[PDB]
Scaffold this active site. Structure first.
Site, PDB file in Angstrom:
ATOM      1  CG  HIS A  40      74.310  38.616 -55.996  1.00  0.00           C
ATOM      2  ND1 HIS A  40      73.831  39.905 -55.981  1.00  0.00           N
ATOM      3  CD2 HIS A  40      75.092  38.491 -54.900  1.00  0.00           C
ATOM      4  CE1 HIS A  40      74.326  40.544 -54.937  1.00  0.00           C
ATOM      5  NE2 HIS A  40      75.097  39.709 -54.266  1.00  0.00           N
TER       6      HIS A  40
ATOM      7  CG  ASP B 143      72.459  44.087 -51.701  1.00  0.00           C
ATOM      8  OD1 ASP B 143      73.267  45.005 -51.401  1.00  0.00           O
ATOM      9  OD2 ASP B 143      72.766  43.056 -52.355  1.00  0.00           O
TER      10      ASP B 143
ATOM     11  CG  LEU C 230      66.400  42.840 -59.627  1.00  0.00           C
ATOM     12  CD1 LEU C 230      64.912  42.768 -59.278  1.00  0.00           C
ATOM     13  CD2 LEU C 230      67.225  41.764 -58.879  1.00  0.00           C
TER      14      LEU C 230
ATOM     15  CD  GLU D 115      73.319  49.020 -52.308  1.00  0.00           C
ATOM     16  OE1 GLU D 115      72.877  47.866 -52.564  1.00  0.00           O
ATOM     17  OE2 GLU D 115      74.516  49.335 -52.514  1.00  0.00           O
TER      18      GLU D 115
ATOM     19  CG  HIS E 287      77.714  47.764 -45.347  1.00  0.00           C
ATOM     20  ND1 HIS E 287      76.561  48.495 -45.547  1.00  0.00           N
ATOM     21  CD2 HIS E 287      77.746  46.834 -46.334  1.00  0.00           C
ATOM     22  CE1 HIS E 287      75.931  48.034 -46.615  1.00  0.00           C
ATOM     23  NE2 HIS E 287      76.630  47.028 -47.113  1.00  0.00           N
TER      24      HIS E 287
END
Ligand SMILES: [Ca+2]
Ligand SMILES: [Ca+2]
Ligand SMILES: [Mg+2]
Ligand SMILES: [Mg+2]
Lengths: 548, 548
Positions: free
Chosen positions: A101, A204, A209, A246, A313
């Site tokens: 995205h 990421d 997808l 990821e 994070h």
């Protein structure tokens, strides 16, 4: 072996690490000045969080340009110097590549929302860059990921007059990978940075997808066929560069992202399966979930390598555990209901473990002794806290704490003007928790982490060896061996808050003496039936060698 | 049993704990406001360093009025309030009785130095209060205690035209106990405070009262005679009070300061023997010297109780170790020449141990686990450091660190206006080390200490039970049992910095099941010959019960 199997990774956000000019925002000059710190820590590879132009609605995972540097962080000249300077120190750097995205502020989406045809009648080639629907009833019943904020994966665009698909925020419209023009844009965006010398990408949100009717819209074969193509492009044009995935999936679907020996995909994948089970095991005083999940992981390809981590994070994700396992985790680790977000917990490592350094060292030794390449999160190496008064996972992303001066030495700007406000509470504040303090302390968590990385660096079986769990006769004591080039290591870890007693099945090692990696102290030789009795203090970690 | 056998003593200096009126000096109304801290710490008895008027040439051990209150500290009424509020909280209080000497500014010595007779002819009753000599050749070749300051134990007084005796400072002349009026004076002073409700005395420097030619002038039978008379007075007039002897002597001589069942002297003595062997054993990873020095301690009387400590307001003293033990302790614990003073090391407990919390916890458990009643030194329960800039032993007497506010919360005055300047360094300064921090911190050293005392309190055998050393077959591992009222505690401790294994001789305990005092975690049952193997992590302590 390739470099990434021997590497220690350190994850940082360039905006919250080192401000070099007082604007209250970390930048690349600032990061370059701190590179001897990361090197002396024993770090081999930086992983930079997204650095691209962006309106920062998702802290930068909403990219408004793939071929530039956010003004906040400096210029592309600054970036190049930082990259030159890290390589001069034998550091590798990997960026974050946001494929699924883009920001709704990207020029592509600004074009695509104009309709299928432009006001001068010509087709608008950008329209098919995104995923449109007339009413928004396709791909229903598929999971919402930001369950706390978004009610649907379809949002109406009032200009284009129809719906567009997003797995993440409304401001992050998904790219349409059934359009062949879109695939080549991300090939080219990758090519741009790899030409500059970057050593690889953390890719990421790869599972999401491609979207197909009648499916979960995850791990789709067609998605894997796009990633097989990335790896071919990289392996052909940029040998030696690392592709890290990821993939927040269950073990069977995760190993898929390595690909196979014939059709490779990713070099490395984040071992999400084990991470939550290290915390359940500590509260349950019971390690069996670690062994269970670890055996549910198939042998991966030769080129592949797991990437172990404790925090990141993000939130501590609880979405790939059971309903029972999840409720337990919430009760153990989220006493305040505010500490929950998106099926997960938003706390730093140290607060999760009640600031108990004995527990902090235990998990980090299991991190370094489990098979894979570890990744440290910035500031965990000094025991930083969180700030839940910041919205959405931002309370774990507060500025680094270098010293007890102004704003922790992150910046000369006052903490109110720092992008995120540096923590000043009595337990985790920069006056109590900072790098300078811990470089002068003989026994600091910082120096402990560095001592420990050096001990692991000395024993290549930690990075490359096999793994075999050992019977201990006590669910609180986790023991296993790592075997490589005729070094056998024995890692015995207590997961309880008091002394525990084991009985280890060292039958294959009769007539061998275990000796400490630290200090070379001899333990009794294994004899008789091979059953080896041990006592362990609370949260103890025995790092042992089995001589021949 | 007597209250002091149960007690946990806390050693603080009123000038230094809490200032109540902004003058930069601690006072008694300051201490009174902190009384709840101490009770909630688990402290039973306060030991106050000397609070008398004095020019403070030895921080108060140079007394100028035995029956008053130093103006710095407040008034006699401030003192009575404090003793009322302390007794109201279950707190005993003992003061420091400086017996062997006064200040040269004491009225007595001001009188005595005029000479044998007054100008008007009549004899000067105060002259023979002190020890005089015409030429200072008597008591030749006796030890000098303050070797760094004093070259002789005799000093010429200009006005009296002859020499006077002093074991400590030229401004601290020795009192002449061959004079019976001197004895009556000290009995008198004792009565003054015991009549105000004080609960007893630390008696300061008891081996040095009498000097006799042709002796060491230490531990003389005439000195014991006087101390016996002290005990007789208190037993007769003020039953239930405490008398504490600071007797830095070898084991054969220290036990003498208890007296006999027929002829009592002191209720309690400091275990100076074991103290330096604790630190010695840590750096050698070898504990024999602890068992050896303890095995030279004779059996003590019924009323008697040892006082175990780790540090105090004096330097870590090495007068009563061998010449080779002393040199070892300098190499290990005093790298810099500035850290030595007077045959001893002037460092706080956390700096000595390298701020390593594991070692700090280990020594504190052995403190609490050895026979006697322990005494904590103010601020070691939060890990205070030292200020070696300050002269003499003042570097270990900096003000208490209560929060991170002004002056660490000691005073509303600035650091530069406090009696001793509160520590502000990056490692131990009040920004990183303060009581408020450690109360909010779930895993602070303060909370560990309170929790560790609470555990001891609930097992009477630590205060009252016997001691028995257990063979471990490993010098690094110290094992001993404590038995009292049908409970048997087994204490295993690892003095090595790496994992160690041992082989316990629990042969007297075959069939007994060992459990941990915290959570009753079961260890294997003692069987066979009773040779019981253990493994331990670095600086572990196991606190076990042997269930019958
Ligand atoms: Ca997609
Ligand atoms: Ca004397
Ligand atoms: Mg900046
Ligand atoms: Mg005052």
């Amino acid at each position: 072996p390739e470099w990434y199997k021997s590497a220690v990774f350190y994850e940082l956000s360039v905006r919250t690490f080192q401000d070099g000019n007082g604007d209250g925002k970390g930048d690349f000059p600032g990061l370059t000045s701190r590179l001897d710190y990361l090197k002396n820590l024993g770090v081999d590879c930086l992983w930079l969080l997204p650095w691209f132009p962006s309106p920062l609605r998702d802290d930068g995972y909403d990219v408004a340009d793939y071929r530039g540097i956010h003004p906040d962080l400096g210029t592309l000249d600054d970036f190049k110097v930082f990259l030159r300077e890290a390589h001069a120190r034998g550091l590798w750097v990997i960026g974050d590549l946001v494929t699924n995205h883009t920001s709704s502020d990207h020029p592509w989406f600004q074009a695509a929302r104009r309709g299928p045809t432009l006001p001068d009648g010509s087709p608008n080639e950008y329209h098919d860059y995104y995923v449109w629907s007339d009413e928004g009833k396709e791909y229903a019943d598929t999971r919402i990921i930001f369950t706390d904020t978004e009610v649907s994966n379809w949002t109406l665009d009032e200009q284009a007059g129809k719906y567009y698909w997003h797995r993440f925020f409304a401001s992050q419209p998904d790219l349409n990978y059934d359009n062949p023009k879109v695939v080549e844009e991300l090939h080219g965006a990758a090519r741009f940075w790899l030409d500059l010398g970057l050593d690889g990408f953390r890719v990421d949100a790869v599972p999401y997808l491609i979207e197909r009717e009648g499916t979960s819209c995850e791990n789709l074969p067609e998605t894997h066929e796009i990633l097989k193509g990335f790896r071919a492009m990289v392996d052909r044009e940029y040998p030696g560069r690392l592709l890290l995935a990821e993939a927040q999936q269950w073990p069977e679907e995760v190993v898929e992202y390595f690909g196979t020996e014939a059709e490779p995909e990713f070099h490395m994948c984040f071992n999400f399966p084990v991470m939550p089970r290290l915390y359940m095991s500590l509260k349950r005083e019971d390690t069996s979930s670690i062994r269970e999940i670890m055996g549910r992981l198939p042998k991966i390809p030769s080129f592949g390598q797991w990437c172990i981590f404790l925090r990141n994070h993000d939130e501590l994700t609880l979405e790939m555990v059971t309903d029972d396992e999840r409720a337990f985790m919430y009760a153990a680790y989220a006493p305040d209901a505010r500490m929950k977000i998106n099926v997960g917990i938003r706390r730093r490592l140290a607060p999760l473990l009640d600031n108990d350094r004995r527990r902090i060292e235990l998990l980090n030794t299991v991190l370094l002794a489990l098979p894979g390449s570890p990744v440290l999160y910035y500031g965990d190496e000094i025991g930083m806290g969180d700030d839940l008064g910041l919205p959405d996972r931002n309370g774990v992303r507060t500025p680094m704490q270098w010293n007890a001066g102004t704003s922790g030495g992150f910046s000369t700007a006052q903490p109110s003007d720092c992008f995120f406000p540096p923590i000043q509470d009595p337990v985790y504040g920069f006056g109590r928790v900072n790098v300078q303090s811990q470089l002068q302390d003989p026994s600091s968590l910082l120096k402990w982490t560095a001592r420990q990385l050096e001990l692991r660096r000395a024993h290549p079986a930690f990075a490359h060896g096999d793994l075999t769990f050992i019977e201990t006769g006590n669910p609180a004591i986790l023991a296993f061996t790592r075997q490589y080039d005729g070094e056998t290591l024995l890692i015995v870890s207590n997961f309880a808050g008091n002394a525990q007693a084991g009985l280890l099945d060292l039958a294959p090692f009769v007539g061998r003496a275990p000796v400490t990696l630290s200090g070379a102290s001899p333990l009794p030789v294994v004899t008789g039936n091979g059953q080896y009795p041990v006592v362990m203090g609370k949260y103890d970690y025995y790092w042992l060698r089995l001589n021949s």
